[PDB]
Nucleic acid binder design. Structure first.
Ligand code: MG
Ligand code: MG
Ligand code: MG
Ligand code: MG
Ligand code: MG
Ligand code: MG
Ligand code: MG
Ligand code: MG
Ligand code: MG
Ligand code: MG
Ligand code: MG
Ligand code: MG
Ligand code: MG
Ligand code: MG
Ligand code: MG
Ligand code: MG
Ligand code: MG
Ligand code: MG
Ligand code: MG
Ligand code: MG
Ligand code: MG
Ligand code: MG
Ligand code: MG
Ligand code: MG
Ligand code: MG
Ligand code: MG
Ligand code: MG
Ligand code: MG
Ligand code: MG
Ligand code: MG
Ligand code: MG
Ligand code: MG
Ligand code: MG
Ligand code: MG
Ligand code: MG
Ligand code: MG
Ligand code: MG
Ligand code: MG
Ligand code: MG
Ligand code: MG
Ligand code: MG
Ligand code: MG
Ligand code: MG
Ligand code: MG
Ligand code: MG
Ligand code: MG
Ligand code: MG
Ligand code: MG
Ligand code: MG
Ligand code: MG
Ligand code: MG
Ligand code: MG
Ligand code: MG
Ligand code: MG
Ligand code: MG
Ligand code: MG
Ligand code: MG
Ligand code: MG
Ligand code: MG
Ligand code: MG
Ligand code: MG
Ligand code: MG
Ligand code: MG
Ligand code: MG
Ligand code: MG
Ligand code: MG
Ligand code: MG
Ligand code: MG
Ligand code: MG
Ligand code: MG
Ligand code: MG
Ligand code: MG
Ligand code: MG
Ligand code: MG
Ligand code: MG
Ligand code: MG
Ligand code: MG
Ligand code: MG
Ligand code: MG
Ligand code: MG
Ligand code: MG
Ligand code: MG
Ligand code: MG
Ligand code: MG
Ligand code: MG
Ligand code: MG
Ligand code: MG
Ligand code: MG
Ligand code: MG
Ligand code: MG
Ligand code: MG
Ligand code: MG
Ligand code: MG
Ligand code: MG
Ligand code: MG
Ligand code: MG
Ligand code: MG
Ligand code: MG
Ligand code: MG
Ligand code: MG
Ligand code: MG
Ligand code: MG
Ligand code: MG
Ligand code: MG
Ligand code: MG
Ligand code: MG
Ligand code: MG
Ligand code: MG
Ligand code: MG
Ligand code: MG
Ligand code: MG
Ligand code: MG
Ligand code: MG
Ligand code: MG
Ligand code: MG
Ligand code: MG
Ligand code: MG
Ligand code: MG
Ligand code: MG
Ligand code: MG
Ligand code: MG
Ligand code: MG
Ligand code: MG
Ligand code: MG
Ligand code: MG
Ligand code: MG
Ligand code: MG
Ligand code: MG
Ligand code: MG
Ligand code: MG
Ligand code: MG
Ligand code: MG
Ligand code: MG
Ligand code: MG
Ligand code: MG
Ligand code: MG
Ligand code: MG
Ligand code: MG
Ligand code: MG
Ligand code: MG
Ligand code: MG
Ligand code: MG
Ligand code: MG
Ligand code: MG
Ligand code: MG
Ligand code: MG
Ligand code: MG
Ligand code: MG
Ligand code: MG
Ligand code: MG
Ligand code: MG
Ligand code: MG
Ligand code: MG
Ligand code: MG
Ligand code: MG
Ligand code: MG
Ligand code: MG
Ligand code: MG
Ligand code: MG
Ligand code: ZN
Lengths: 154, 112, 116, 101, 14, 59, 140
RNA sequence: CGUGAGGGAAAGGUGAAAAGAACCCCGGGAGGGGAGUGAAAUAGAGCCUGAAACCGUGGGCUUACAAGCAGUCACGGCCCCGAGGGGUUGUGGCGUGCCUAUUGAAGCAUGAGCCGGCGACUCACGGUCGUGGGCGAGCUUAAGCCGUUGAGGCGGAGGC
RNA sequence: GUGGAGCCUGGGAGUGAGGGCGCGAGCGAUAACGUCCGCGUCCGAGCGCGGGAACAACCGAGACCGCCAGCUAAGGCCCCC
RNA sequence: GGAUGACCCCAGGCGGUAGGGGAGCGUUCCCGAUGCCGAUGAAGGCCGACCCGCGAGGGCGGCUGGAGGUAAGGGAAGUGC
C-alpha cells in the first residue's frame, strides 16, 4: 500500500458521513489497493553441507549400481558427432531407448550426438548431480568420467 | 403450430406493460384486438404492434388461419435499464432507472 | 503464485442452498439466511429424535390406559400387575395388542389382576 | 399365528413370511437363527413370563446393510461451536420362516 | 463522493 | 416531522399481495348497430360515425 | 412394525344428564370423551372423539359460595371494557354457558382443540334436538 | 473533479473463416418471424463460457376461524417416480435469528437490504526451544573464483 | 488410594471486568438484582437435557452417534398434560 | 491376541468459551511430464433420490460447454469469508 500509485489523501472525513471510515484508496481493503503479504523477490538458495552433497552423489550412483543399471564404457566407437552414430552405438551397448539414460562423458563430440534424444539427459562429469542421476533410469559413464566421479566422492 | 413475436428493448416500465398484457392472455385474436384499441394505456400501443406482428407471422410464415388464432402465451421480460441522473435538493444526485421491456406474444390455433 | 478464490466459495454456498430447499423466502435463496436456518434445523433434529422416543411411549401409555379401563383397571394397576406376573411385553407391543388382538390383551389383563 | 420376539434390545411382532429389519446379528447371510418368544397368539394364546420355554422363531438372514445417512449436527450460538457428523445405523434383514412354539 | 452533507445537530441532552 | 422510514424490506409475498387489487378491467364494449364493429356504449361510433341510428361525423 | 394409525371411524354420540352433577368434575369427563381418550386407538392429531350431548345444564351444581363469588370476565378491548359477571347471573341468563365455559377451558388450544369444542351440545332443560342421531345415554 | 497545485476512473474475448444473415412478411423505426451461412446462431454482433441476487410465464401440491426466529419430529391426503423413494403440507408435538460485546442478549445493546467477486498472522535477518538428517573434538565456510546455461565444484578469511 | 493422580526439566498460552447462590463477617438501615473479604458451589464455558407456568447460575443431572425398547431422578398422577 | 498398524478381542474415557496439542480436506503453482487423460469432448457451469468418507470432501452418471487438463509420490504458498 506504500508502493501503489494512488495519493495519500483521506477520501472523506472521519465522522458524520454515514459511511465507513477510510484513509487513502491504497489501503488493502480497497479494490485496486495494495497487497498485504504478497511475495517480494526472494533468494530460495541455501548452503547444503558439502558432505551431504558428496554422500548423496556417491549414494545415487550406488543405487543405480545395486540395480545393475550403471554401465561404464571405455569409449564410443563410431560416435563422431552424428545422432545416427550414437543410436548405432547405442544398440550395440544394449541401450535401445526404452530406458532413460544419463550419458556422462567429457567427449564434446559424443554429447552432441546424444543431445536431441528424448530419452537421454546429457552431461559432463563435472556436472554429475543426484537429481539428474535419479530422474533417469540408467547411468552410463566414461572410464574418464568415472575416474572423475571417484575424485569427487573422495 | 405456434407463431411468436418479440419486441425487444421497448422503452417502457415492465410492470406497466404487464397490466395491458394480462388483459389479452388467453383471449382470441379478435377480442384481443378490440380490447387493446380501447385500453387507456400507453402500453396498449406496444402490445398491439407485437400482437399484429405475431399474427402476420402465423398466416404468412407458419400456415395458420387468421380466424382461429388466440393468444396462447404472452409475457413481458425486463431488459437493461437506462440509468439517468435526477437532481435533488442540497447537492444530491438520484439515479432514475428508465426501465425497458421485452414483450412477447405467442399465438396458437383454436381448432373447432 | 496466487490462489484466487475461483471456484471454491460458489460450491460451498451451493451445498448449503441445496440442503435449504423448501425454506421460506430468503431462507432458501440467500446463503446467509439458509445457513442460519440450518443451524436451528440441525439442533431440532437432534432434539426431536430424543423426543420421538418419548412421544411414542406416551401414545402407547395413553392407548394402554383406555383398553385397561374397559376391563376395569387403570394403567398403573395393569403395569404393576405385569411386573409381578413376570410378563415383559413392552408398551409398543401392549398397545398394538390392545388394538389388534383384544382377546390377547384381555388375558394379559387377567394375568395382571390375578398376580397382584 | 404371530409371535412377539425380542432381538436387539427391542420387541417385534412377526408372522411367517414377514420381512423385518433389526439390529446387526453376528450371522452369515442365508444362515438361520432362532428368536426368543415372549408371547404367541392367534389360534392359541401362550404368555411368556418372560420367555415362552419351548417356543422360538426361525429366521433367515437375507443380508446385512447400513441405513440411510442421518446428519447429526450441533450448534451453540455465540461461541463458534459447530459439529457435523454423518451417521448410518447398521442393521440386519430377516425373513420370518416359521413359528415353532 | 462529491459533497458531504453535514448532519443535523443533536438534541441538547445535558 | 422526523422523517418516517420503512423498518424492514417488504417481502415478495407482502409486496405482490398489496398488488392483489391492481388488475385492469377490460374495456366495456358493445357492437355498433350499423357496422357491427365493437365499441364502448354511449359514444359516437368511431368506425362509421353513427349514433342513435344516424350519421353524426365523418371518419 | 409401525404403530397402528386407525382409519376414519364414524363417531359415537352420547348423552349426559348434568342434573345435580358438580360442574368441574363433569367437565373433566366430557373433555376426555371429546378427546376420545377412552378409545384404545386414540390418536392425538385427528378429531376421533365422541359427540357429547348434555341436558339439564341449568341444574348443574357447585360447592361453597361460588354462586355468589365465582366471576366470569369478558374484556371488550375498549377502555374500561372489562365486564365481570357472577355465576348466579350467568345461570339466570345463559345457563348452558356455565358448562360450556368449563369444558372449553379443559380442551387443547389450537385448530384441533377448537373442533372438539364444536362436538359438544349442551342444553338447559331436559330435552335436546338430536333425536336423529339416537344418542347413547351415559352414566358418569 | 478541482481556481489552482493536485486528484483520477471505468472499459478486453463472434466464428476455423464474415460465410457479419440477399430476398419475402408485420412494423414509422426499433424489434421480430421466415429464408440463408455455419460443426454449432439461447456463437447474430446488446456476440465464448454465462454462476448468484433479482423479475417473469407455465405446471404439481397447498392456503381465506388463523397466533409466526418460519424450522424440526409424527401421522394422514394429494401429485410424481417406478414392502420403496421424491415433491407438497393438513393436524398434533417441540422450539427465544446470526455475529459481536458481556457477569448476563431473542433480546428493545453492535453490525449486516440481498447476491457475486476483493478482503486480515507474512517476509527478511537475528534469537530460543523442538524436530529430520550429515559430520563429530570437532562442525562449518562468507565475499569471491571456475564451470554450467535450471550441473556442480572450488574458496578456511572467518564463526561456533 | 494407579488416578486426564503426583513430582522434575523445558516449548505454547490464555486470564489478571466476573456473576448468582448457601454459610461466616465488615460496610449499609438486623435496605438494595447493594458493596467488600473468607469457605463452598454452580453460571461463566453446561443459554444442552428434566422440574420449577415462563427464566444463566433453585431442585434433578454432566448430552460420542443411532433405536417407534426398559428402570429411575427432582417434580408429579381431576382436565389442558 | 499376532508379533513392533496387518486385524481381532476386552475394558475405560470422549459437554465445552479463552487457549494448548494432534490428524486431515480443498485452492494456486513446481517436479513426476518429450509422459498420461482429451473433440468417441478439457476446464468451467447445471442436476442427481446413486457410490466412498465421521467430516472437510471425493467419485460416478445425465444435461450444458467447446480446449484444455493432469496421477501415485513429493515440493512451495498472494490458500478457504
Ligand atoms: Mg501512498
Ligand atoms: Mg504513490
Ligand atoms: Mg501519481
Ligand atoms: Mg496521480
Ligand atoms: Mg502520502
Ligand atoms: Mg494527500
Ligand atoms: Mg463517527
Ligand atoms: Mg467513524
Ligand atoms: Mg446507514
Ligand atoms: Mg460506507
Ligand atoms: Mg452505510
Ligand atoms: Mg448503504
Ligand atoms: Mg463503506
Ligand atoms: Mg474516513
Ligand atoms: Mg479503509
Ligand atoms: Mg484506507
Ligand atoms: Mg493511518
Ligand atoms: Mg496507503
Ligand atoms: Mg493494483
Ligand atoms: Mg502488511
Ligand atoms: Mg527459511
Ligand atoms: Mg534436447
Ligand atoms: Mg534430451
Ligand atoms: Mg528424459
Ligand atoms: Mg381502460
Ligand atoms: Mg394479417
Ligand atoms: Mg427538487
Ligand atoms: Mg426533484
Ligand atoms: Mg446547487
Ligand atoms: Mg432504487
Ligand atoms: Mg432507481
Ligand atoms: Mg429496466
Ligand atoms: Mg480469497
Ligand atoms: Mg435453495
Ligand atoms: Mg416446503
Ligand atoms: Mg418448510
Ligand atoms: Mg423462496
Ligand atoms: Mg427458493
Ligand atoms: Mg431466488
Ligand atoms: Mg445444527
Ligand atoms: Mg437422538
Ligand atoms: Mg387413556
Ligand atoms: Mg415396575
Ligand atoms: Mg415393565
Ligand atoms: Mg383392526
Ligand atoms: Mg433399525
Ligand atoms: Mg442433527
Ligand atoms: Mg450457547
Ligand atoms: Mg446468536
Ligand atoms: Mg440460542
Ligand atoms: Mg459464534
Ligand atoms: Mg456467553
Ligand atoms: Mg456458533
Ligand atoms: Mg455463530
Ligand atoms: Mg463427526
Ligand atoms: Mg417534528
Ligand atoms: Mg415542519
Ligand atoms: Mg419526510
Ligand atoms: Mg409492507
Ligand atoms: Mg423482491
Ligand atoms: Mg411471485
Ligand atoms: Mg416469497
Ligand atoms: Mg405489504
Ligand atoms: Mg398499492
Ligand atoms: Mg394483480
Ligand atoms: Mg360428574
Ligand atoms: Mg384425537
Ligand atoms: Mg354458592
Ligand atoms: Mg471545474
Ligand atoms: Mg478544469
Ligand atoms: Mg481499467
Ligand atoms: Mg475471436
Ligand atoms: Mg475474432
Ligand atoms: Mg475450430
Ligand atoms: Mg475478422
Ligand atoms: Mg411496408
Ligand atoms: Mg430489420
Ligand atoms: Mg416478429
Ligand atoms: Mg431477422
Ligand atoms: Mg462435431
Ligand atoms: Mg447454449
Ligand atoms: Mg456458443
Ligand atoms: Mg472460443
Ligand atoms: Mg450469452
Ligand atoms: Mg444473457
Ligand atoms: Mg407461479
Ligand atoms: Mg371461533
Ligand atoms: Mg379452513
Ligand atoms: Mg404421533
Ligand atoms: Mg410418500
Ligand atoms: Mg409427508
Ligand atoms: Mg407444528
Ligand atoms: Mg453464523
Ligand atoms: Mg461493547
Ligand atoms: Mg456493555
Ligand atoms: Mg426478537
Ligand atoms: Mg428486534
Ligand atoms: Mg443503542
Ligand atoms: Mg439487534
Ligand atoms: Mg459498544
Ligand atoms: Mg459488531
Ligand atoms: Mg442499520
Ligand atoms: Mg436478496
Ligand atoms: Mg460476499
Ligand atoms: Mg505467526
Ligand atoms: Mg512478503
Ligand atoms: Mg528457528
Ligand atoms: Mg535445527
Ligand atoms: Mg555433514
Ligand atoms: Mg568443511
Ligand atoms: Mg486434566
Ligand atoms: Mg493436569
Ligand atoms: Mg509449562
Ligand atoms: Mg506448542
Ligand atoms: Mg504454539
Ligand atoms: Mg488478559
Ligand atoms: Mg489480579
Ligand atoms: Mg488489571
Ligand atoms: Mg480486578
Ligand atoms: Mg470478588
Ligand atoms: Mg471484585
Ligand atoms: Mg439471580
Ligand atoms: Mg446471595
Ligand atoms: Mg438453611
Ligand atoms: Mg470482617
Ligand atoms: Mg453483588
Ligand atoms: Mg444480599
Ligand atoms: Mg463465588
Ligand atoms: Mg467471558
Ligand atoms: Mg446446570
Ligand atoms: Mg461445571
Ligand atoms: Mg441457560
Ligand atoms: Mg434466555
Ligand atoms: Mg432449566
Ligand atoms: Mg422451565
Ligand atoms: Mg432458569
Ligand atoms: Mg442451565
Ligand atoms: Mg416403572
Ligand atoms: Mg419421588
Ligand atoms: Mg391423562
Ligand atoms: Mg467405546
Ligand atoms: Mg482419552
Ligand atoms: Mg460423558
Ligand atoms: Mg471435546
Ligand atoms: Mg492438502
Ligand atoms: Mg521431488
Ligand atoms: Mg514438462
Ligand atoms: Mg488418447
Ligand atoms: Mg468432433
Ligand atoms: Mg458432449
Ligand atoms: Mg481444476
Ligand atoms: Mg486451473
Ligand atoms: Mg460432486
Ligand atoms: Mg463437465
Ligand atoms: Mg493448446
Ligand atoms: Mg500437478
Ligand atoms: Mg500429489
Ligand atoms: Mg513462492
Ligand atoms: Mg490474502
Ligand atoms: Zn359503427
Amino acid at each position: 500500500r506504500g508502493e501503489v500509485a494512488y495519493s495519500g489523501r483521506k477520501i472523506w472525513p472521519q465522522k458524520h458521513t454515514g459511511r465507513a471510515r477510510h484513509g487513502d484508496i491504497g489501503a488493502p481493503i480497497f479494490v485496486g489497493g495494495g497487497v498485504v503479504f504478497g511475495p517480494k523477490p526472494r533468494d530460495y538458495s541455501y548452503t547444503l553441507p558439502k558432505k551431504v552433497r558428496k554422500k548423496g552423489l556417491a549414494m545415487a550412483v550406488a543405487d543405480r549400481a545395486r540395480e545393475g543399471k550403471l554401465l561404464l564404457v571405455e569409449a564410443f566407437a563410431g560416435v563422431n558427432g552424428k545422432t545416427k552414430e550414437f543410436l548405432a552405438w547405442a544398440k550395440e551397448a544394449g541401450l535401445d531407448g526404452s530406458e532413460s539414460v544419463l550419458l556422462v562423458t567429457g567427449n564434446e563430440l559424443v554429447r552432441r550426438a546424444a543431445r536431441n534424444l528424448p530419452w537421454v539427459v546429457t552431461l559432463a562429469p563435472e556436472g554429475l548431480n543426484v537429481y539428474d542421476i535419479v530422474r533417469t533410469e540408467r547411468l552410463v559413464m566414461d572410464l574418464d568420467a568415472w575416474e572423475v566421479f571417484q575424485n569427487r566422492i573422495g | 403450430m405456434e407463431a411468436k413475436a418479440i419486441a425487444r428493448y421497448v422503452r417502457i416500465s415492465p410492470r406497466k406493460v404487464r397490466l395491458v398484457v394480462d388483459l389479452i392472455r388467453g383471449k382470441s385474436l379478435e377480442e384481443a384486438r378490440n380490447i387493446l384499441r380501447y385500453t387507456n394505456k400507453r402500453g396498449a400501443y406496444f402490445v398491439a404492434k407485437v400482437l399484429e406482428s405475431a399474427a402476420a407471422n402465423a398466416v404468412n410464415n407458419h400456415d395458420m388461419l387468421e380466424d382461429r388464432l388466440y393468444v396462447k402465451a404472452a409475457y413481458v421480460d425486463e431488459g437493461p435499464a437506462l440509468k439517468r441522473v435526477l437532481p435533488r435538493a442540497r447537492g444530491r444526485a438520484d439515479i432514475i432507472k428508465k426501465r425497458t421491456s421485452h414483450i412477447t406474444v405467442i399465438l396458437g390455433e383454436k381448432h373447432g | 503464485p496466487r490462489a484466487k478464490t475461483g471456484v471454491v466459495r460458489r460450491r460451498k454456498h451451493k451445498k448449503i442452498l441445496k440442503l435449504a430447499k423448501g425454506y421460506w423466502g430468503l431462507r432458501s435463496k440467500s446463503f446467509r439466511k439458509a445457513r442460519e436456518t440450518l443451524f436451528a434445523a440441525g439442533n431440532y433434529a437432534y432434539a426431536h429424535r430424543k423426543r420421538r422416543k418419548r412421544d411414542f411411549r406416551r401414545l402407547w401409555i395413553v392407548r394402554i390406559n383406555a383398553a385397561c379401563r374397559q376391563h376395569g383397571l387403570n394403567y398403573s394397576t395393569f403395569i404393576h400387575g405385569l411386573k409381578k406376573a413376570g410378563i415383559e411385553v413392552d408398551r409398543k407391543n401392549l398397545a398394538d395388542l390392545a388394538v389388534r388382538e383384544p382377546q390377547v390383551f384381555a388375558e394379559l389383563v387377567e394375568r395382571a389382576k390375578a398376580a397382584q | 399365528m404371530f409371535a412377539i420376539v425380542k432381538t436387539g434390545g427391542k420387541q417385534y411382532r412377526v408372522e411367517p413370511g414377514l420381512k423385518l429389519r433389526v439390529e446387526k446379528l453376528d450371522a452369515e447371510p442365508g444362515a438361520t437363527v432362532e428368536l426368543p418368544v415372549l408371547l404367541l397368539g392367534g389360534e392359541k394364546t401362550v404368555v411368556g413370563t418372560p420367555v415362552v420355554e419351548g417356543a422360538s422363531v426361525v429366521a433367515e438372514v437375507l443380508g446385512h446393510g447400513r441405513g440411510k445417512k442421518i446428519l447429526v449436527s450441533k450448534f451453540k450460538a455465540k461461541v463458534q461451536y459447530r459439529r457435523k457428523k454423518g451417521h448410518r445405523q447398521p442393521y440386519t434383514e430377516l425373513l420370518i420362516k416359521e413359528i415353532r412354539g | 463522493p462529491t459533497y458531504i452533507p453535514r448532519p443535523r445537530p443533536p438534541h441538547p441532552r445535558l | 416531522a422526523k422523517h418516517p422510514v420503512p423498518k424492514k424490506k417488504t417481502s415478495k409475498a407482502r409486496r405482490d399481495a398489496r398488488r392483489s387489487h391492481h388488475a385492469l378491467t377490460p374495456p366495456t364494449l358493445v357492437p355498433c348497430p350499423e357496422c357491427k364493429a365493437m365499441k364502448p356504449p354511449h359514444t359516437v361510433c368511431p368506425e362509421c360515425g353513427y349514433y342513435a341510428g344516424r350519421k353524426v361525423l365523418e371518419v | 412394525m409401525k404403530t397402528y394409525v386407525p382409519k376414519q371411524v364414524e363417531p359415537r354420540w352420547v348423552l349426559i344428564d348434568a342434573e345435580g352433577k358438580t360442574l368441574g368434575r363433569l367437565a373433566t369427563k366430557i373433555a376426555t370423551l371429546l378427546r376420545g381418550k377412552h378409545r384404545p386407538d386414540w390418536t392425538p392429531n385427528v378429531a376421533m372423539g365422541d359427540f357429547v350431548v348434555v341436558v339439564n345444564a341449568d341444574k348443574i351444581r357447585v360447592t361453597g359460595k361460588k354462586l355468589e363469588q365465582k366471576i366470569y370476565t369478558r374484556y371488550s378491548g375498549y377502555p374500561g371494557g372489562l365486564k365481570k359477571i357472577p355465576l348466579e347471573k350467568m345461570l339466570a341468563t345463559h345457563p348452558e354457558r356455565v358448562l360450556e365455559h368449563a369444558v372449553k377451558g379443559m380442551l387443547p388450544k389450537g385448530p384441533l382443540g377448537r373442533r372438539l369444542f364444536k362436538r359438544l351440545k349442551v342444553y338447559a332443560g331436559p330435552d335436546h334436538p338430536h333425536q336423529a342421531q339416537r344418542p347413547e345415554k351415559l352414566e358418569v
